[PDB]
Design a protein around this nucleic acid. Structure first.
Lengths: 243, 87, 121
RNA sequence: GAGGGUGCUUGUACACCCAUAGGGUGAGGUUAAGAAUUACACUCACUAAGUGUGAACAACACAUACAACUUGUGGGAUAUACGCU
């Protein structure tokens, strides 16, 4: 404020006005009319959650039971439909390995490593993402070779082709780091969603759609990909067996 | 029965003079319609690279195997429902 | 007829798609050195398509004014522009891919400069 | 090969080069591990680019075609990619 780096934040006619916990009373759940009911400022209040299949119902259920603490929340009157912006302070439960959930790891065609667990899914990268640096490196290697073949010779073949060899060499380090970060994100999901068992499909088939497209990351052994998820697996603890 | 339900063109005298005829205007119109369809498809192909990469590959696969939601879903990772929704 | 759908809308959307491409590809780029270096490639597309749109709008407005002056058209009328503004307002593609306020303001200032009186209806 | 540097600004293309620049790194905070070490879409920052003269990473001179060239400041709004549920 004093240095003048930021102006005075003002308010508008549509700012959600705040309110604390003392305003809300009787924070319980109602099943007969299907609405978590309460009483704000001498006025009873029932929520029209609509077709809410998201985590809002679960969050409300923990909130009324006292499992989740509530902070100073806000009320908005956006477009007639009254809305409640509730801020919840939730204790971070200690996530530990629970070997009873199955994690489904698959290779794909434009959506590299695909991981499915329960109602959750995550993709590790994307096809053009993995191919951008590869295409750049290959094209640059082509033009470097063309320039070197047309450059001044007689100063040594090593001085002529060290960059030519290094440009092909760095592709290997690129793909190695790529497999590294991919397995890192796979293990990150495995730890994050408390998954205990992870299994990687062969998912190879024959003819059909496959046998014409070569699969991003190819088979489950490209650049020791399998190994780089095995050695990493028990590095974190999750159980990656076989599929 | 089918072969006995078929007459002979010789039963009509000088049938080669006034029957079995065609108009080249129809052929030219058919080829023009084909060219119009080809131009529309070329327009669509030119629009394709402007789309997101996943949705472009979905269409490209759907144009070389053909609205095979099942085999595409196993190929992709998304389910039948998700893959159909993305298509 | 000034302007083509390919040279105005298609190139604009191509720049937008390239920006989304770089945005997607920046997630797994060099990491651990901060957000700024990750979004470095995004930073290239700072005012790319805005500059392209401004240049094409300038060219189109200049050709319109040149045609009007060369035929001594002392009054230029925009046909059904109010209704097109109305439909564009209740849409998404038309507002965010068809700069009509910029075209209208360029036409207004480049016609008030040349004496042509501009009408909207 | 994209993308770029110099050729007043913008667009296209153009000569000359740089370009794994969606990369090569440096420091600070934080985290994890017995350690090596890893990590951060945490923060900040550096590094490539016409020819000649010129000791020079000094400076100066020279360097393609067409079209356009009223912007700047702010507010409201929408969407994209990422992170959490």
């Amino acid at each position: 404020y004093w240095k003048g780096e930021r102006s005075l934040p003002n308010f508008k006619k549509d700012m959600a006005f705040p309110f604390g916990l003392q305003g809300i009373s009787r924070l319980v759940y109602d099943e007969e009319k299907k609405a978590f009911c309460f009483r704000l400022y001498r006025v009873p209040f029932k929520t029209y959650l609509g077709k809410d299949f998201t985590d809002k119902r679960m969050l409300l259920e923990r909130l009324v039971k006292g499992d989740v603490k509530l902070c100073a929340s806000n009320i908005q009157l956006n477009g007639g439909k009254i809305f409640w912006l509730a801020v919840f302070e939730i204790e971070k439960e200690k996530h530990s390995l629970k070997p009873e959930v199955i994690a489904e790891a698959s290779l794909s065609l434009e959506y590299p490593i695909v991981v499915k667990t329960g109602k959750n899914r995550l993709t590790i990268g994307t096809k053009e993402e993995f191919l951008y640096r590869r295409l750049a490196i290959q094209a640059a290697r082509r033009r470097t070779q063309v320039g070197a073949t047309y450059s001044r010779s007689g100063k040594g073949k090593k001085r002529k082709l060290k960059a030519v060899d290094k440009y092909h060499k760095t592709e290997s380090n690129y793909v190695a780091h790529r497999i590294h970060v991919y397995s890192r994100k796979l293990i990150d999901f495995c730890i994050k969603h408390q998954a205990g068992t992870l299994i990687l499909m062969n998912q190879e088939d024959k003819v059909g759609i496959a046998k014409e497209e070569e699969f991003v990351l190819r088979n489950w052994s490209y650049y020791e990909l399998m190994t780089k998820i095995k050695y990493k697996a028990e590095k974190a603890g999750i159980e990656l067996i076989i599929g | 029965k089918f072969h006995k339900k078929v007459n002979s063109l010789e039963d009509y005298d000088n049938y080669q003079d006034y029957m079995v005829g065609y108009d080249p205007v129809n052929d030219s119109e058919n080829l023009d319609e084909q060219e119009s369809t080809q131009k529309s498809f070329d327009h669509i192909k030119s629009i394709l690279p402007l789309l997101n990469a996943d949705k472009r590959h979905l269409i490209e696969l759907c144009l070389k195997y053909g609205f095979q939601y099942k085999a595409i879903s196993k190929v992709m990772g998304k389910g039948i429902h998700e893959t159909s929704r993305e298509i």
